Each structure stands twice: as C-alpha cells, then as structure tokens.
Coordinates of C-alpha atoms and ligand atoms in Angstrom, one line a residue:
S19 CA -4.4 28.8 7.0
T20 CA -7.8 30.6 6.9
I21 CA -10.5 29.9 9.5
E22 CA -12.5 28.7 6.5
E23 CA -10.2 26.2 4.9
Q24 CA -9.3 24.8 8.3
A25 CA -13.0 24.8 9.2
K26 CA -13.4 22.8 6.0
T27 CA -10.7 20.4 7.1
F28 CA -12.3 20.2 10.6
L29 CA -15.7 19.3 9.0
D30 CA -14.1 16.8 6.6
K31 CA -12.5 15.0 9.6
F32 CA -15.9 15.1 11.4
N33 CA -17.9 13.6 8.6
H34 CA -15.7 10.5 8.3
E35 CA -15.4 10.0 12.0
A36 CA -19.1 10.7 12.5
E37 CA -20.3 8.5 9.7
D38 CA -18.5 5.6 11.3
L39 CA -19.5 6.1 14.9
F40 CA -23.1 6.8 13.9
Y41 CA -23.1 3.5 11.9
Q42 CA -21.8 1.5 14.8
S43 CA -24.4 3.1 17.1
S44 CA -27.2 2.6 14.5
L45 CA -26.3 -1.1 14.0
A46 CA -26.3 -1.7 17.8
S47 CA -29.7 -0.1 18.2
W48 CA -31.0 -2.1 15.3
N49 CA -29.9 -5.4 17.0
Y50 CA -31.8 -4.5 20.1
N51 CA -35.0 -3.5 18.3
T52 CA -34.9 -6.7 16.2
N53 CA -33.8 -9.0 19.0
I54 CA -34.5 -7.6 22.4
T55 CA -31.6 -9.1 24.5
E56 CA -29.8 -8.1 27.7
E57 CA -26.4 -7.8 26.0
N58 CA -28.0 -6.3 22.9
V59 CA -29.3 -3.5 25.1
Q60 CA -25.8 -3.3 26.6
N61 CA -24.1 -3.1 23.2
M62 CA -26.5 -0.4 22.1
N63 CA -26.4 1.9 25.2
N64 CA -22.6 1.8 25.0
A65 CA -22.4 2.4 21.3
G66 CA -24.8 5.2 21.8
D67 CA -22.8 6.8 24.7
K68 CA -19.7 6.7 22.5
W69 CA -21.6 8.7 19.9
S70 CA -22.8 11.3 22.4
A71 CA -19.4 11.8 23.8
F72 CA -17.9 12.2 20.3
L73 CA -20.6 14.8 19.4
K74 CA -19.8 16.7 22.6
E75 CA -16.0 16.8 22.0
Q76 CA -16.6 17.8 18.4
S77 CA -19.1 20.5 19.4
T78 CA -16.8 22.0 22.0
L79 CA -14.0 21.9 19.4
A80 CA -15.9 23.6 16.6
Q81 CA -16.4 26.7 18.7
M82 CA -12.9 27.6 17.7
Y83 CA -14.1 28.7 14.3
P84 CA -15.7 32.2 14.4
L85 CA -19.1 31.9 12.8
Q86 CA -18.9 35.4 11.5
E87 CA -15.4 34.8 10.0
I88 CA -17.2 32.2 7.9
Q89 CA -18.4 32.7 4.3
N90 CA -19.4 29.4 2.6
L91 CA -23.0 29.2 3.8
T92 CA -22.9 25.4 3.4
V93 CA -20.0 25.2 5.9
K94 CA -21.8 27.6 8.2
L95 CA -24.8 25.3 8.4
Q96 CA -22.7 22.3 9.4
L97 CA -20.6 24.4 11.8
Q98 CA -23.8 25.9 13.1
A99 CA -25.4 22.6 13.9
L100 CA -22.2 21.5 15.7
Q101 CA -21.3 24.4 17.9
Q102 CA -24.7 24.4 19.6
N103 CA -24.1 24.1 23.4
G104 CA -27.6 23.7 24.7
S105 CA -27.8 22.3 28.2
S106 CA -24.0 22.0 28.5
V107 CA -24.2 25.8 28.8
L108 CA -25.6 25.2 32.3
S109 CA -23.6 24.6 35.5
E110 CA -23.2 21.0 36.4
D111 CA -25.6 21.3 39.4
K112 CA -28.2 22.8 37.1
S113 CA -27.8 20.3 34.2
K114 CA -28.0 17.5 36.8
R115 CA -31.3 18.9 38.2
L116 CA -32.8 19.5 34.8
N117 CA -32.0 15.9 33.8
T118 CA -33.5 14.7 37.0
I119 CA -36.7 16.7 36.4
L120 CA -37.0 15.5 32.8
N121 CA -36.5 11.8 33.9
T122 CA -39.0 12.3 36.7
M123 CA -41.7 13.9 34.6
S124 CA -41.2 11.2 32.0
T125 CA -41.6 8.4 34.4
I126 CA -44.6 9.6 36.3
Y127 CA -46.2 10.0 32.9
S128 CA -45.5 6.5 31.7
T129 CA -46.0 4.9 35.1
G130 CA -48.7 6.9 36.8
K131 CA -52.0 5.3 37.4
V132 CA -55.5 6.0 38.6
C133 CA -57.7 3.6 40.6
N134 CA -61.4 2.9 40.6
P135 CA -63.2 4.8 43.4
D136 CA -65.3 1.7 44.1
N137 CA -62.2 -0.6 44.0
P138 CA -58.8 0.8 45.1
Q139 CA -57.2 -2.3 43.7
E140 CA -58.4 -1.8 40.2
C141 CA -55.9 0.6 38.8
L142 CA -55.2 1.7 35.2
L143 CA -52.2 3.2 33.4
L144 CA -52.7 5.7 30.6
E145 CA -51.7 3.0 28.2
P146 CA -53.7 1.0 27.8
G147 CA -56.7 1.4 30.0
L148 CA -57.4 5.1 30.3
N149 CA -56.7 5.3 26.6
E150 CA -59.0 2.4 25.8
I151 CA -61.7 4.1 27.8
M152 CA -61.3 7.6 26.2
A153 CA -61.4 6.0 22.8
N154 CA -64.3 3.6 23.2
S155 CA -66.6 4.5 26.1
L156 CA -70.0 6.1 25.5
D157 CA -70.7 6.8 29.2
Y158 CA -70.4 10.4 30.2
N159 CA -69.5 9.6 33.8
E160 CA -66.9 7.0 33.1
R161 CA -65.1 9.2 30.6
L162 CA -65.3 12.1 33.1
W163 CA -63.9 9.9 35.8
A164 CA -60.9 8.9 33.6
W165 CA -60.3 12.5 32.2
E166 CA -60.3 14.2 35.7
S167 CA -58.5 11.4 37.5
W168 CA -55.6 11.4 35.0
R169 CA -55.2 15.2 35.5
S170 CA -55.9 15.1 39.2
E171 CA -53.5 12.2 40.1
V172 CA -50.6 12.6 37.7
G173 CA -51.0 16.0 36.2
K174 CA -50.7 17.6 39.7
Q175 CA -47.5 15.6 40.3
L176 CA -46.2 17.3 37.2
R177 CA -47.1 20.9 38.2
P178 CA -44.2 21.4 40.6
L179 CA -41.7 19.8 38.2
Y180 CA -42.9 21.7 35.2
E181 CA -42.5 25.1 36.8
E182 CA -38.9 24.4 37.8
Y183 CA -38.4 23.0 34.2
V184 CA -39.4 26.2 32.4
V185 CA -37.0 28.2 34.6
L186 CA -34.1 25.9 33.9
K187 CA -35.0 25.7 30.2
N188 CA -35.4 29.5 29.7
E189 CA -32.0 29.8 31.4
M190 CA -30.4 27.3 29.0
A191 CA -32.0 29.2 26.1
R192 CA -31.0 32.7 27.2
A193 CA -27.4 31.7 27.8
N194 CA -27.5 30.2 24.3
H195 CA -28.5 33.7 23.0
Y196 CA -32.2 33.2 22.6
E197 CA -35.0 35.1 24.4
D198 CA -36.7 32.0 25.9
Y199 CA -37.0 28.2 25.4
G200 CA -39.9 28.7 22.9
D201 CA -37.8 31.1 20.8
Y202 CA -35.2 28.4 20.9
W203 CA -37.6 25.9 19.3
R204 CA -38.7 28.2 16.5
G205 CA -35.0 28.3 15.8
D206 CA -35.7 25.3 13.5
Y207 CA -37.4 27.4 10.9
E208 CA -34.9 30.3 11.0
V209 CA -32.8 30.8 7.9
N210 CA -30.3 33.7 7.4
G211 CA -27.7 35.1 5.1
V212 CA -29.7 34.2 2.0
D213 CA -31.3 37.1 0.2
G214 CA -34.9 36.3 -0.7
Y215 CA -35.4 33.2 1.5
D216 CA -34.6 34.5 5.0
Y217 CA -37.1 33.8 7.8
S218 CA -37.3 35.0 11.3
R219 CA -38.2 33.1 14.5
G220 CA -40.9 35.5 15.4
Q221 CA -42.2 35.3 11.8
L222 CA -43.2 31.7 12.5
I223 CA -45.7 32.9 15.2
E224 CA -47.4 35.2 12.7
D225 CA -47.5 32.9 9.7
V226 CA -49.1 30.3 12.0
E227 CA -51.7 32.7 13.3
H228 CA -52.4 34.2 9.9
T229 CA -52.9 30.8 8.3
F230 CA -54.9 29.6 11.3
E231 CA -57.5 32.4 10.8
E232 CA -58.2 31.1 7.3
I233 CA -58.9 27.6 8.8
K234 CA -61.4 28.8 11.4
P235 CA -64.5 28.8 9.2
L236 CA -63.9 25.2 8.2
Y237 CA -63.2 24.2 11.8
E238 CA -66.3 26.1 13.3
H239 CA -68.5 24.2 10.8
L240 CA -66.8 20.9 11.6
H241 CA -67.3 21.9 15.3
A242 CA -71.0 22.7 14.9
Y243 CA -71.6 19.5 13.0
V244 CA -69.9 17.2 15.5
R245 CA -71.3 19.2 18.4
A246 CA -74.8 18.4 17.1
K247 CA -74.0 14.7 16.7
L248 CA -72.5 14.5 20.2
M249 CA -75.8 15.9 21.5
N250 CA -77.7 12.9 20.2
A251 CA -75.0 10.7 21.8
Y252 CA -75.0 12.5 25.2
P253 CA -78.6 13.8 25.5
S254 CA -78.9 16.8 27.8
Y255 CA -75.2 17.1 28.5
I256 CA -74.3 19.6 25.8
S257 CA -75.5 23.2 24.9
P258 CA -76.4 24.0 21.3
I259 CA -74.2 27.0 21.5
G260 CA -71.5 25.8 23.9
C261 CA -68.0 24.5 23.7
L262 CA -67.5 20.7 23.5
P263 CA -66.8 19.2 26.9
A264 CA -63.2 18.1 27.0
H265 CA -63.8 14.5 28.1
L266 CA -66.1 13.6 25.2
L267 CA -63.7 13.9 22.2
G268 CA -62.2 10.5 21.5
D269 CA -58.9 10.5 23.2
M270 CA -57.6 11.7 26.5
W271 CA -57.1 15.3 25.3
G272 CA -59.1 15.9 22.2
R273 CA -55.8 15.9 20.2
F274 CA -57.6 14.1 17.4
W275 CA -61.4 13.5 16.9
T276 CA -60.7 10.3 15.0
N277 CA -62.6 8.2 17.4
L278 CA -65.8 10.3 17.1
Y279 CA -66.3 8.6 13.7
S280 CA -69.0 6.1 14.8
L281 CA -71.0 8.9 16.4
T282 CA -70.6 11.4 13.6
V283 CA -70.5 9.4 10.3
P284 CA -72.7 11.2 7.7
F285 CA -74.0 8.0 6.0
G286 CA -73.5 5.0 8.3
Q287 CA -75.1 2.7 5.7
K288 CA -72.4 3.2 3.0
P289 CA -69.5 0.8 3.2
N290 CA -66.2 2.3 4.2
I291 CA -63.6 1.2 1.6
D292 CA -61.4 -1.4 3.2
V293 CA -59.4 -3.9 1.1
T294 CA -58.0 -5.7 4.2
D295 CA -60.0 -8.7 3.0
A296 CA -59.3 -8.6 -0.8
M297 CA -55.6 -8.8 0.2
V298 CA -56.1 -12.0 2.0
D299 CA -58.1 -13.7 -0.7
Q300 CA -55.3 -12.9 -3.0
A301 CA -52.8 -14.4 -0.6
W302 CA -50.8 -11.2 -0.1
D303 CA -47.9 -11.1 2.3
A304 CA -45.4 -8.6 3.7
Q305 CA -43.1 -9.0 0.7
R306 CA -45.9 -8.3 -1.8
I307 CA -47.0 -5.2 0.3
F308 CA -43.5 -3.7 0.2
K309 CA -42.9 -4.8 -3.3
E310 CA -46.1 -3.0 -4.4
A311 CA -45.0 0.1 -2.4
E312 CA -41.6 -0.1 -4.2
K313 CA -43.4 -0.3 -7.5
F314 CA -45.4 2.8 -6.6
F315 CA -42.3 4.9 -6.3
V316 CA -40.5 3.6 -9.4
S317 CA -43.7 4.4 -11.3
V318 CA -43.0 8.1 -10.7
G319 CA -39.2 8.1 -11.4
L320 CA -37.7 7.2 -8.0
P321 CA -35.3 4.3 -7.6
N322 CA -35.9 0.7 -6.5
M323 CA -35.2 -0.1 -2.9
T324 CA -31.6 -1.1 -2.4
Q325 CA -30.3 -4.7 -2.4
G326 CA -29.8 -5.2 1.3
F327 CA -32.8 -3.1 2.2
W328 CA -34.7 -6.3 1.2
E329 CA -32.0 -8.5 3.0
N330 CA -31.5 -6.5 6.2
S331 CA -35.1 -5.3 6.7
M332 CA -37.3 -7.0 9.3
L333 CA -40.6 -6.8 7.4
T334 CA -42.4 -9.3 9.7
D335 CA -42.7 -10.1 13.5
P336 CA -40.3 -13.0 14.2
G337 CA -42.9 -14.2 16.7
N338 CA -41.9 -15.8 20.0
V339 CA -38.4 -16.0 21.3
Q340 CA -37.6 -13.1 19.0
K341 CA -39.1 -10.2 20.9
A342 CA -38.8 -6.9 19.1
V343 CA -40.3 -3.4 19.1
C344 CA -43.0 -3.4 16.4
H345 CA -43.5 0.4 16.1
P346 CA -43.1 0.9 12.3
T347 CA -39.9 2.7 11.7
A348 CA -37.6 3.7 8.7
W349 CA -33.9 3.6 9.3
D350 CA -31.0 5.5 7.8
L351 CA -28.1 3.7 9.5
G352 CA -25.4 5.4 7.4
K353 CA -23.0 4.5 4.7
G354 CA -25.8 3.7 2.2
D355 CA -27.5 1.3 4.6
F356 CA -31.3 1.7 4.6
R357 CA -33.9 -0.5 6.4
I358 CA -37.5 -0.6 7.4
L359 CA -38.5 -2.3 10.7
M360 CA -42.1 -3.2 10.9
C361 CA -44.1 -6.3 12.0
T362 CA -46.3 -6.2 8.9
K363 CA -49.8 -7.6 8.9
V364 CA -51.9 -8.3 5.8
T365 CA -54.2 -5.3 6.4
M366 CA -55.1 -2.2 4.4
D367 CA -53.7 -0.1 7.2
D368 CA -50.3 -1.8 7.0
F369 CA -50.3 -1.5 3.2
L370 CA -50.6 2.3 3.6
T371 CA -48.0 2.4 6.5
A372 CA -45.6 0.7 4.2
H373 CA -46.0 3.4 1.6
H374 CA -45.6 6.1 4.3
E375 CA -42.6 4.5 5.7
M376 CA -41.0 3.7 2.4
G377 CA -41.6 7.4 1.7
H378 CA -39.1 8.2 4.4
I379 CA -36.5 5.8 3.0
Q380 CA -36.8 7.4 -0.4
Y381 CA -36.2 10.8 1.2
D382 CA -33.2 9.4 3.0
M383 CA -31.8 7.9 -0.2
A384 CA -32.3 11.1 -2.1
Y385 CA -30.1 13.1 0.2
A386 CA -27.5 10.5 1.0
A387 CA -24.8 12.4 -0.9
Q388 CA -25.1 15.5 1.3
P389 CA -22.6 15.8 4.1
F390 CA -23.6 14.0 7.3
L391 CA -25.0 17.0 9.1
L392 CA -27.1 18.1 6.2
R393 CA -28.8 14.7 5.9
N394 CA -32.3 15.5 7.2
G395 CA -35.6 17.0 6.1
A396 CA -35.5 20.8 5.1
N397 CA -37.1 21.5 8.5
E398 CA -38.8 19.6 11.4
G399 CA -42.0 19.2 9.4
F400 CA -40.9 17.9 6.0
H401 CA -40.2 14.1 6.5
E402 CA -43.7 13.3 7.9
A403 CA -45.3 15.5 5.2
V404 CA -43.5 13.4 2.7
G405 CA -44.6 10.2 4.4
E406 CA -48.2 11.2 4.7
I407 CA -48.3 12.2 1.0
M408 CA -47.7 8.6 0.0
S409 CA -50.6 7.1 1.9
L410 CA -52.9 9.7 0.4
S411 CA -52.3 8.5 -3.2
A412 CA -52.2 4.8 -2.2
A413 CA -55.6 4.8 -0.4
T414 CA -57.6 6.5 -3.3
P415 CA -60.2 4.2 -4.8
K416 CA -58.5 4.7 -8.2
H417 CA -55.2 3.4 -6.9
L418 CA -56.7 0.3 -5.2
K419 CA -58.4 -0.5 -8.5
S420 CA -55.4 -0.3 -10.8
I421 CA -53.7 -2.5 -8.3
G422 CA -56.4 -5.1 -8.4
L423 CA -57.3 -4.8 -4.7
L424 CA -60.6 -3.1 -5.4
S425 CA -62.9 -4.2 -8.2
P426 CA -64.3 -1.7 -10.7
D427 CA -67.6 -2.7 -9.2
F428 CA -67.3 -0.6 -6.1
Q429 CA -69.2 2.6 -7.1
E430 CA -68.0 5.8 -5.5
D431 CA -70.9 8.0 -4.4
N432 CA -71.0 11.7 -3.4
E433 CA -71.8 10.1 0.0
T434 CA -68.9 7.7 0.2
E435 CA -66.9 10.9 -0.5
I436 CA -68.2 13.0 2.3
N437 CA -67.9 10.0 4.6
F438 CA -64.2 9.9 3.7
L439 CA -63.5 13.6 3.9
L440 CA -65.3 13.8 7.3
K441 CA -63.3 10.9 8.6
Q442 CA -60.1 12.7 7.3
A443 CA -61.2 16.0 8.8
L444 CA -61.8 14.5 12.3
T445 CA -58.1 13.7 12.4
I446 CA -56.5 16.4 10.2
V447 CA -58.7 19.5 10.8
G448 CA -59.7 18.7 14.4
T449 CA -56.1 18.6 15.5
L450 CA -55.0 22.0 14.0
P451 CA -56.7 24.2 16.6
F452 CA -55.6 21.9 19.4
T453 CA -52.0 21.9 18.2
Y454 CA -51.8 25.7 17.6
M455 CA -53.4 26.5 21.0
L456 CA -51.2 24.1 22.9
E457 CA -48.0 25.6 21.4
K458 CA -49.3 29.1 21.8
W459 CA -49.7 28.5 25.5
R460 CA -46.2 27.2 25.9
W461 CA -44.7 30.0 23.8
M462 CA -46.4 32.5 26.1
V463 CA -45.4 30.6 29.2
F464 CA -41.8 30.6 28.1
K465 CA -42.0 34.3 27.3
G466 CA -43.3 35.0 30.8
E467 CA -46.6 36.4 29.7
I468 CA -48.6 34.0 31.8
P469 CA -47.8 34.1 35.6
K470 CA -47.6 30.8 37.3
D471 CA -50.8 31.8 39.2
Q472 CA -52.7 32.1 35.9
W473 CA -51.3 29.0 34.0
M474 CA -54.4 26.8 34.2
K475 CA -56.7 29.8 34.1
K476 CA -55.1 31.0 30.8
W477 CA -55.0 27.4 29.5
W478 CA -58.7 26.9 29.8
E479 CA -59.5 30.4 28.7
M480 CA -57.6 29.5 25.6
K481 CA -59.1 26.1 25.2
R482 CA -62.6 27.7 25.2
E483 CA -61.8 30.6 22.8
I484 CA -59.5 29.0 20.2
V485 CA -60.5 25.3 20.3
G486 CA -64.1 25.7 21.5
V487 CA -63.6 23.0 24.2
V488 CA -64.4 23.4 27.9
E489 CA -63.1 21.6 31.0
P490 CA -65.8 19.4 32.7
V491 CA -64.4 20.3 36.1
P492 CA -62.9 23.6 37.2
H493 CA -59.1 23.4 37.6
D494 CA -57.0 25.7 39.9
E495 CA -53.2 26.3 39.7
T496 CA -52.7 23.0 41.5
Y497 CA -53.2 21.2 38.2
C498 CA -50.9 21.1 35.1
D499 CA -53.2 19.9 32.4
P500 CA -50.9 20.6 29.5
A501 CA -48.3 18.4 31.1
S502 CA -50.7 15.5 31.1
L503 CA -49.9 15.2 27.4
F504 CA -46.9 13.2 26.4
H505 CA -45.1 15.9 24.3
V506 CA -45.4 18.5 27.1
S507 CA -44.0 16.4 30.0
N508 CA -41.6 14.7 27.6
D509 CA -40.1 18.0 26.4
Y510 CA -40.9 17.8 22.6
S511 CA -41.9 20.8 20.5
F512 CA -45.4 20.6 19.1
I513 CA -45.8 23.1 16.3
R514 CA -44.3 20.7 13.7
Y515 CA -47.7 18.9 13.6
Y516 CA -49.2 22.1 12.5
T517 CA -46.7 22.9 9.8
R518 CA -46.3 19.4 8.5
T519 CA -50.1 19.3 7.9
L520 CA -50.0 22.5 5.9
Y521 CA -46.9 21.2 4.0
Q522 CA -48.4 17.9 3.1
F523 CA -51.3 19.4 1.2
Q524 CA -49.1 22.0 -0.5
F525 CA -46.9 19.1 -1.7
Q526 CA -49.9 17.1 -2.7
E527 CA -51.6 19.9 -4.6
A528 CA -48.3 20.6 -6.3
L529 CA -47.6 17.0 -7.3
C530 CA -51.1 16.4 -8.5
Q531 CA -51.1 19.5 -10.7
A532 CA -47.8 18.1 -12.1
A533 CA -49.7 14.8 -12.6
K534 CA -52.4 16.6 -14.6
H535 CA -55.0 15.4 -12.0
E536 CA -58.5 16.5 -13.1
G537 CA -61.2 16.3 -10.4
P538 CA -61.2 17.1 -6.6
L539 CA -57.8 17.0 -4.9
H540 CA -58.7 14.2 -2.5
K541 CA -59.1 11.7 -5.4
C542 CA -55.6 12.2 -6.7
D543 CA -53.1 9.5 -7.3
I544 CA -49.6 10.5 -8.3
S545 CA -48.7 7.0 -9.8
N546 CA -47.2 7.0 -13.3
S547 CA -46.2 10.7 -13.1
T548 CA -42.5 11.1 -13.5
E549 CA -43.2 14.8 -13.7
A550 CA -44.5 14.5 -10.1
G551 CA -41.6 12.4 -8.9
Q552 CA -39.1 14.8 -10.5
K553 CA -40.6 17.8 -8.7
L554 CA -40.6 15.8 -5.5
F555 CA -37.0 14.7 -6.0
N556 CA -35.7 18.2 -6.5
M557 CA -36.4 19.1 -2.9
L558 CA -35.8 15.6 -1.5
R559 CA -32.1 15.4 -2.6
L560 CA -31.5 18.8 -0.9
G561 CA -31.7 17.4 2.6
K562 CA -31.1 20.4 4.8
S563 CA -28.5 22.0 2.5
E564 CA -30.9 24.7 1.4
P565 CA -33.3 27.0 3.3
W566 CA -36.6 25.1 3.8
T567 CA -38.2 28.1 2.2
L568 CA -36.3 27.2 -1.0
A569 CA -36.9 23.4 -0.7
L570 CA -40.6 24.2 -0.5
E571 CA -40.4 26.5 -3.5
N572 CA -38.7 23.8 -5.5
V573 CA -41.8 21.7 -5.0
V574 CA -44.8 24.0 -4.8
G575 CA -43.6 27.2 -6.5
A576 CA -43.8 29.4 -3.4
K577 CA -41.6 30.1 -0.4
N578 CA -44.0 30.0 2.4
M579 CA -46.5 27.9 4.3
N580 CA -49.9 28.3 2.8
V581 CA -53.3 26.9 3.9
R582 CA -55.2 27.1 0.7
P583 CA -54.3 23.6 -0.4
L584 CA -55.6 22.1 2.9
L585 CA -58.8 24.0 2.3
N586 CA -59.0 22.9 -1.3
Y587 CA -58.7 19.3 -0.2
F588 CA -61.7 19.7 2.1
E589 CA -63.8 22.0 0.0
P590 CA -66.3 19.3 -0.9
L591 CA -66.9 18.6 2.8
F592 CA -66.9 22.3 3.6
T593 CA -69.8 23.0 1.3
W594 CA -71.8 20.0 2.6
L595 CA -71.0 21.1 6.2
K596 CA -72.4 24.7 5.6
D597 CA -75.6 23.2 4.3
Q598 CA -75.9 20.8 7.2
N599 CA -75.4 23.7 9.6
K600 CA -78.1 25.7 7.8
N601 CA -80.2 25.8 10.9
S602 CA -77.4 25.3 13.6
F603 CA -75.5 27.7 15.6
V604 CA -72.0 28.0 14.1
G605 CA -69.4 28.9 16.7
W606 CA -69.5 28.9 20.4
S607 CA -70.0 30.8 23.6
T608 CA -67.1 30.7 26.1
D609 CA -69.4 31.1 29.1
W610 CA -71.2 27.8 29.2
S611 CA -69.7 24.9 31.1
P612 CA -71.0 21.4 32.3
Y613 CA -71.0 22.7 35.9
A614 CA -72.5 26.2 35.4
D615 CA -75.6 24.9 37.1
Ligands
NAG701 C1 -18.5 25.5 -0.1 O1 -17.4 24.5 0.0 C2 -17.7 23.3 -0.8 C3 -16.6 22.3 -0.5 O2 -15.9 22.7 0.6 C4 -17.7 23.7 -2.3 O3 -17.9 22.5 -3.1 C5 -18.9 24.7 -2.5 O4 -18.9 25.1 -3.9 C6 -18.7 25.9 -1.6 N1 -20.0 26.7 -1.7 C7 -20.0 27.8 -2.4 C8 -20.6 27.7 -3.8 O5 -19.6 28.9 -1.9
NAG702 C1 -20.6 27.5 24.0 O1 -20.0 27.7 25.3 C2 -18.6 28.1 25.1 C3 -18.0 28.2 26.5 O2 -19.0 28.2 27.5 C4 -18.5 29.4 24.4 O3 -17.1 29.8 24.2 C5 -19.2 29.3 23.0 O4 -19.2 30.6 22.4 C6 -20.6 28.7 23.2 N1 -21.2 28.4 21.8 C7 -21.9 29.3 21.2 C8 -21.2 30.1 20.1 O5 -23.1 29.6 21.5
NAG703 C1 -48.6 3.1 -13.8 O1 -48.0 2.6 -15.0 C2 -48.4 1.2 -15.3 C3 -47.6 0.9 -16.6 O2 -48.4 0.9 -17.8 C4 -49.9 1.1 -15.5 O3 -50.2 -0.3 -15.8 C5 -50.6 1.5 -14.2 O4 -52.0 1.4 -14.3 C6 -50.2 3.0 -13.9 N1 -50.8 3.4 -12.7 C7 -51.9 4.1 -12.7 C8 -53.1 3.6 -12.0 O5 -52.0 5.2 -13.3
CL704 CL1 -56.2 19.3 29.0
ZN705 ZN1 -43.6 8.9 9.5

C-alpha cells in the first residue's frame, strides 16, 4: 500500500474514534459547566484525560507517514496537525519543570494580592478589586498605588519564572524545527504548497508592521484628544506633549481605553442609544432574544438553529442550587450537536452577545461536514471576527428600529454618531498599538534580541515610542511588567487580537458592499441580504480546509490582511478628531515622565 492511501486509512480511523471521544469529553464538560458538582468535575476531568491520551497516541502514531511522501494537501493538513510533538519533544524532567512553571505563574496571577499600606489586613485580588479600581477610580494616587503594587508584588514573583519559561519554550520550539517560541506561534498563519496563497511566518511580522503604520495617524489623533481630556480630569499631572501615564487608562494595563468614556465623551448631553429598557416594557425574555438572533441569520440565507440547540441549550441561569459558569460560550460538541451556554439577562448587551455567540454556532454548523481536524476557523483570528461582525449589524439604530426595540422617534445626530465612533475607537483603536507592541516585545524576547538585563528597559522604551504611554514609576529588571497581564503569564499568543480586528472590518466592508449599503460603513446592517450571507457562507463552510488567505479572498476579494476598511469605519471620527486637534500637539515626546521632576 502507498504511504498516502494508508495515511488516508489512518485518518479515517482517527476521525471516527476522535469524533466519539471528543463527544464524550464535551458532554462531560457541559455537565460540569451547567451543573457544577463534585462528581461532574470528576466525570469531566477523566473524560478529558482520555481524550488527551488518545490525541497523544494518535500523534506519535502519525509520525510514521512521511510528510514529504504526501501529495493530497487535504490529508497533509490533517496529518500536519496530528504529528505536532510540542512539549513532548522535551525530556521528562524538562516537561515536568515547564508544567510546574506554567502552573505556578498561573496561580500567582489568579491568587496574588496587594494590601493597603494603611491597613495590612485589607488586601485585594486583581479580580475584582484592583480591576474595580483601575476601571472606576478618578484618584491619581489610588490608581498609582494599585498599578505599581500589582507589578511590584506579583509581577516580580513572575520575573524569575518567566525567564526560565522562555528558555524552556524556545527549546521546545527549536527541537520542533522552529527558530524560537514566537516563530512557533506565527506558525498559525503559515500556508505552503499552494501556488498563489502561500504565506511565510516572518511575513506576518511585516504585514502587521506595514498595516500598523497606516493606523498611526488615526491613533495619534485619538491619543491627542484623550490626552487633552485626561488633563482636565487630572489637572497638572500630564504634559501637553507627553505620553499618557500608564495608570490612568481605564484598566490595569491600558489594554482597552473603554473605561475612559465618561472622561472623554464628545457630547455628554446626547443620550447613548440603549434599548435595555424597551426590551423590558415589551416583556422580552431569553427565548425571544435568541429567537430574534436566529431570525437575523435566516434573513441573510443561513439556516435556523437546530432542534436540540433549543432543547439542550442553557439560555438562562438556573439560579440557586444549580451553580454554573455564566461566561457566555458557544459549543460544538460534535456529531451535529450545537449549544449555547449563557445566563441571559434582558439587556441590550446580552441581546448583542447572543448574536455574537450565535455567530460562532453558525460558523460551526457551516463547516460541520469537514473532517474533524479541519473543523475550525481559517486561522486563529477568524471565529471572533465572525462573531464581532454580528453585533455590529445588530446594534445599528436602523436594526433596532426594524425590530421594534427603538422607535422611529429617536433622531440620529452627527453628534450621536461621533459619540458612538469615539466609544468604539476607545476599545477598538486604542488596543491595536497596545496589542502590537506587546507581541513585538515577546517576539524579540524569544528571538534573543533583548538581553534579560534590558527586558523592562526595552519594554518601557517600546511603550513610550509605539503606544505613547509611560510608566509612573521607574522599573528595573527586578520587575516583569508584561507578565502581569493574563495572556503573558498564562502562555497565550496575543497577535490574534490584532488580526481579528483588521479581519472583522474587511468582512464587514465586504458584506455591506454585497448588501448595497449606502452611507457610512458604521451604519450598516446586513439583514435581508442573502447576497451577504452567501459570500459569508462561502468561507464559513471551508473551516480550515483551505489556506486562510483563500478563505479571506472568498469573502473580501483579496488574499491579505488590509487596514483600509478599519480606517473607513472610523473616517467620520477621524475628520472630527483632526479638527478637534487643530490647536493641540499631535504625537508625543518619549522624554517626559511623571517623575522627571
Ligand atoms: C484528497 O482525498 C480526498 C478523500 O481521501 C478526496 O476526496 C479529495 O478529492 C483529495 N484531494 C484532491 C483533490 O487531491
Ligand atoms: C516527534 O518526535 C519523534 C521522536 O522524538 C520524531 O520521530 C518525529 O519526527 C517528531 N515529529 C516531527 C515530524 O516533528
Ligand atoms: C428583513 O426582511 C423582512 C421581511 O420582509 C423585513 O420585514 C425586515 O424589515 C428586513 N430587515 C431589514 C430591517 O432590512
Ligand atoms: Cl505594563
Ligand atoms: Zn466570541
């Protein structure tokens, strides 16, 4: 037999065995997240360990088939996914140490606490507490206390662990035939053996940097505008030409500027659209929320939710004696079983989350026919882009009207528009520079371009230059500020938030053009457009069977990540911003710091 037709038989055996073990493991996890019990956690952990052990025997059994001796690119993909050693490429004593380090960093992050200087017995965890403060406090000193203490007490515990961690990780990566751990992560965008859609790992770094350059003007103006607003909020604490102090941005790191809305809102008098009241007066409930979301998809040519989705889904919190995790989540348990777990509340926010989450299900259903290993988004950043796209259309004033949740009496002004776009930009645009800079620092650390003795130095040099943000206190190499962020100490790649953001607007611009939308992109609603739903579905059913470059193309007509659509979305705010900054200093000096004097 040929090491192709036997690989095909190996794969066929895997899919049937895998589909069944993944289903048992999924069902077990679903029981525990819907009915937190002691035996339900038992059933789950065991069903999960049976799946991991299967995946390992199957991986170290697929090696047998020479990747080069393979032709059918579709079988190469599957085979590729499977024969990935990863950490198992390490010697038992190493793997053991790496796992200990990961668990340790993880626990000090979720369990570390800081205590009040004037009361050693009043101690706060990051969540909630420090988070509550960083999001709501308007006191410069209290915010500074929380920012520095988090990094001083827990971040420093992470420093030692993080260094050993990159060593061990780069080792895993090299032995797996990659340059370094960061090169390993970029491996998610790599596509080969396909003329015209190939994509290099290093090519990710340059498309990110090239697209980032085009975003800079919008960011600088957003930066100059909020920097002037924060000056009124913190009189005499900030320079007209300086970086924004790190502890004044709305969350513990400045990942999103979302919480800077009350201090930066362009027209505080105009009412912020919020139907979370009109839903109540109409006696709306969880069922109606998801039924309306379901109706939204069918309106563009997608299928109804499945029978069973409605029966097996936990769309409401069971209350007391039925403890469950309420984080909204979309499940693809296998064998055509789809479910959404969410403790739905009658709010505008949950009406949008339902669309986002039902967006994921739709994506899961569209590619259910692909073999097991190809059932996922084209790349790490597609699923959330698809989910975010749904809320965009559902929140538009035009959508809320046609649905009867917003009366045709709510006039939209050029001011309610800028108010909305600014709010959007604080989350969406504010996070792009933060995200790119954080991953850049890690990429460089993994490559070895930043000596342990210059980690923090380079970190803050980069915060000041790229993000235009400065540390309130100086930090030596004793600190590990990037690790005080969940994704860093919890070992998750971060660039996906950058790419997903650019993808979502490419998708949205594409679907809206296919929907014959007329005005500004941010007012678009794709409802009723089967032409939009068809274009969306052409890439959705692909799963990961095609290069992501092709799945993108099937939707936007181009094979690469492009920032123009994001910019088009924000153009109205961008022109307003420029005029607002007519007399302001746009940009920043990297010399200034809160302590320079
Ligand atoms: C790869 O194999 C599958 C089934 O094993 C077959 O249906 C498919 O056409 C092959 N891909 C191509 C077109 O080479
Ligand atoms: C995984 O490790 C095994 C043995 O250590 C090796 O034979 C195999 O080539 C590795 N997988 C690949 C192709 O990276
Ligand atoms: C979607 O189609 C229905 C069917 O006529 C229509 O009533 C509804 O208003 C459409 N959605 C919008 C707002 O375009
Ligand atoms: Cl930081
Ligand atoms: Zn999501």
